[PDB]
């Protein structure tokens, strides 16, 4: 963006830059604020702080190294809270998709000084670098061992029958000979005058209160609703017991957690380089599904050559990266989906390909070469686009012209 | 691989919840010990309806019919016609569609044919005035159930059109921690192939029970005669207690059999309505499963609903357990601070569900 800050470094002394502008850079980072990004605020993700294999070496020797391993990854959670229950589907970049076998929280290994002061303050009432690589009813429902009938009797048939159970007609009649006990629910319809005034005030509130029940701009009105809902979430959680809280919301961001995955490829454990990051990202239900993705795709401006139909092209959708064979199409004045031979030189075109589905409005980029050997000197970003639709079928069609004399 | 369930219990719910979650499920041991084991005809027809309104879904029914493998696809909807077997009324098949209708690639336009009422399933007026309003509370602005022809049992012959124009990303977050003040009582007393006198006697019957009350009581008399009146004589009533304040409705309904007294049924339904309002806090028992499910599939926020200690029965518990099995969500209940009543607030965190099928 125009006016963006740009820092200048002159030379290196003792493997260190001059202190003066390092202070400038450090202060800038300290006071910086971060915009809310759509993808980050809808998925849980975690950068692996440390990697550890829990596989029993006895298994490694008897079956051999080829055996699939169980691995534990520790790190700080980001984005939306991760559900506490095991079985959650996540994708590790460059490895594949796995299921959370176990998950548990650990004490923060690098507590911030403000946090430690509060804990020390808590103790009264009763390290700066971390680089490892370098009969309550509610319970009764959720104890499946107790049958629902057994549950009910302790603290005091099926949904195919829509009509709820009712007592017999005669006993119901005797129960409701009088309308008492429910009068509160229904609207009512020298000193007593004030008493009359109060009831009519309550009725007026009940009759028309909402129509009456301001922020200057429509934007602030939208923000207020979001803030109000967030405030309600906090209040419910603050009333809420820590263990049961974790059971509802899961593990919130900032929690240092241990995640254990089974059936990981052994090559990941053996071929582990600490320089290359390990990125774990949660998957929504749509991300699991596979099918036809309809997207608006265009050749990147700085890419030398146009793309071709049924040409391998590596996509970057969401957390996942994969190679497919897309088909570029045209709407033909919004009549039929006609296959193109190549992408337009300087315009978008509809592109169809098979792969993991994703929500509409999920942007992506395209690359033809990822290996260093074939990098060359040209720009490697080949295509850019936005996913428009997800479907299991599509009807691309080509022009076939029969010739006679 | 598959989440496994036992028996025919909550067949429609388990299938519908599988659709919304996208998680494959297995239902086994369906009426294994019965003389006629396996699925009933209407259950199979219900699966056919699910197949019609979805795409990419795979369903297996066992050779013995006692086991089902279900792999959900995407909700696509469209225009279709469904023939409902006489074993069940139309409301049996309409009810699950209400769950799935707002979240489709295309609008639901389904024409149902068959019996339009029964003793055990939601009636036409129950849907129109009793459940659909709850959806309207959740953000389903446009939804309509048109009664083209009424069909009473046993020969039926009724036709109804379900149209849900509103397509929304996910239900709005509920915040209802108070007991709605119900302002008036309305209802519909309908009859087919019979004299108008029965309807009037029926409305007369309900009026006696409700006359002691302090609110208006006006029941519509919808007498059906002629070609559109179906093939069988029948008559039934639905009474609805309405709270204009926050658009909540409590309703009770039932239909009459041959030889029964119209006045007695009107009295019974009126009493049953007085029962439901006594047992209810924010929603009725017959509306609660819809309310709970939609909250689970809301945005990742805490929705609050006030429920009475009467609603926590066997049906409520199994509903929560099935939800946890499929969605892993736990409903938390807390006492209200009031001492006048013993209601509780059900706080549910949404899963962040979003309607990805719709084109943008």
């Amino acid at each position: 963006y125009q006016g963006a800050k740009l820092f200048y470094l002159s030379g290196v002394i003792n493997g260190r830059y001059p202190d003066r502008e390092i202070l400038n850079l450090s202060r800038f980072i300290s006071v910086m604020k971060f915009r809310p990004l759509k993808w980050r605020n809808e998925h849980p993700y975690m950068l692996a702080d440390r990697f550890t294999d829990l596989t029993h070496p006895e298994l490694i020797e008897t079956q051999g190294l080829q055996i699939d391993r169980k691995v534990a990854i520790y790190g700080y959670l980001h984005g939306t809270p991760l559900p506490s229950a095991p079985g959650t589907r996540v994708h590790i970049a460059g490895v594949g998709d796995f299921s959370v076998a176990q998950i548990e929280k650990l004490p923060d290994p690098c507590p911030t000084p403000f946090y430690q002061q509060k804990l020390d303050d808590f103790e009264r009432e009763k390290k700066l670098i971390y680089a490892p690589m370098s009969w309550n009813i509610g319970k009764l429902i959720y104890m499946d061992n107790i049958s629902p009938e057994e549950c009910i009797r302790r603290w005091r048939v099926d949904l195919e029958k829509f009509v709820p159970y009712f007592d017999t007609f005669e006993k119901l009649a005797k129960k409701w000979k009088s309308v008492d006990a429910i009068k509160e629910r229904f609207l009512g319809a020298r000193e007593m005058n004030a008493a009359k005034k109060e009831k009519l005030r309550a009725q007026f509130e009940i009759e028309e209160g909402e129509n009456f029940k301001e922020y200057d701009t429509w934007y602030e009105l939208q923000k207020a609703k979001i803030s109000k809902q967030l405030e309600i979430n906090n209040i419910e959680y603050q009333e809420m017991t820590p263990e049961q809280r974790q059971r509802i919301e899961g593990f919130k961001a900032g929690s240092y957690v241990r995640i254990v995955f089974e059936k990981v490829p052994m090559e990941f454990v053996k071929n582990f380089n600490p320089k290359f990051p390990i990125v774990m990202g949660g998957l929504l239900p749509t991300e699991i599904k596979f099918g036809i993705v309809k997207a608006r795709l265009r050749r990147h401006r700085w890419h030398k050559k146009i793309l071709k139909t049924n040409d391998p092209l590596v996509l970057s959708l969401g957390w996942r990266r994969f190679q497919t064979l897309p088909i570029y199409t045209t709407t033909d004045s919004r009549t039929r989906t006609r296959m193109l031979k190549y992408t337009p030189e300087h315009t978008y075109c509809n592109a169809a390909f098979y792969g993991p589905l994703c929500s509409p409005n999920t942007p992506f980029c395209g690359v033809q070469i990822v290996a260093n050997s074939d990098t060359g000197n040209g720009f490697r970003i080949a295509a850019t686009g936005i996913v428009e639709e997800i479907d299991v079928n599509i009807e691309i069609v080509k022009k076939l012209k029969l010739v006679g004399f | 691989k598959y989440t496994t369930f036992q028996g025919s219990q909550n067949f429609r719910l388990r299938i519908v919840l599988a659709t919304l979650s996208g998680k494959p499920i297995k239902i086994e041991k369906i009426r294994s010990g019965d003389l006629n084991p396996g699925l009933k005809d209407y259950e199979v027809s219900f699966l056919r309806l699910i197949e019609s309104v979805t795409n990419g879904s795979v369903i297996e029914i066992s050779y013995t019919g006692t086991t089902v493998i279900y792999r959900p696809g995407i909700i696509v909807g469209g225009a279709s016609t469904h023939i409902c077997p006489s074993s069940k009324p139309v409301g049996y098949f309409v009810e699950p569609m209400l769950y799935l209708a707002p979240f489709s690639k295309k609008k639901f336009s389904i024409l149902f044919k068959g019996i339009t009422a029964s003793h055990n399933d939601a009636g036409i007026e129950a849907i129109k005035w009793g459940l659909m309003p709850v959806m309207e509370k959740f953000g389903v602005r446009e939804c309509a159930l048109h009664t083209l022809k009424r069909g009473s049992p046993p020969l039926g012959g009724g036709e109804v059109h379900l149209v849900v124009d509103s397509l929304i990303a996910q239900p709005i977050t509920m915040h209802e921690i108070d007991r709605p003040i119900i302002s008036s009582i309305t209802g519909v007393a309908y009859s087919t192939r019979v004299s108008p006198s029965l309807v009037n006697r029926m409305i007369d019957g309900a009026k006696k029970v409700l006359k002691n009350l302090q609110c208006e009581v006006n029941i519509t008399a919808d007498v059906w005669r002629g070609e559109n009146s179906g093939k069988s004589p029948g008559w039934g009533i639905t009474l609805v207690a309405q709270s204009k304040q926050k658009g909540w409705s409590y309703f009770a309904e039932d239909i009459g059999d041959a030889g029964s007294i119209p006045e007695e049924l009107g009295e019974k339904v009126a009493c049953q309505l007085l029962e439901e309002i006594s047992k209810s806090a924010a929603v009725g028992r017959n509306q609660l499963p819809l309310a709970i499910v939609y909250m689970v599939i809301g945005k990742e926020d805490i929705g609050r609903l006030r429920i009475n200690k009467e609603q926590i029965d066997e049906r409520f518990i199994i509903l929560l357990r099935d939800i946890k099995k499929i969605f892993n969500t736990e409903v938390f209940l807390k006492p209200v601070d009031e001492a006048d009543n013993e209601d509780m607030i059900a706080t549910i965190k949404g899963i962040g569900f979003t309607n990805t099928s719709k084109k943008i």
């Binding site: 299991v392 079928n393 009807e395 | 396996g38 699966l47 056919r48 197949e51 979805t54 795409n55 990419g56 879904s57 795979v58 369903i59 297996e60 029914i61 066992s62 050779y63 013995t64 019919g65 696809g73």
Partner: peptide, 14 residues
């Protein structure tokens, strides 16, 4: 026309 845009289907082995 029912079969044009379908990929699933009911497999009834009863």
């Amino acid at each position: 026309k029912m079969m044009k845009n379908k990929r699933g289907g009911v497999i009834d082995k009863r």
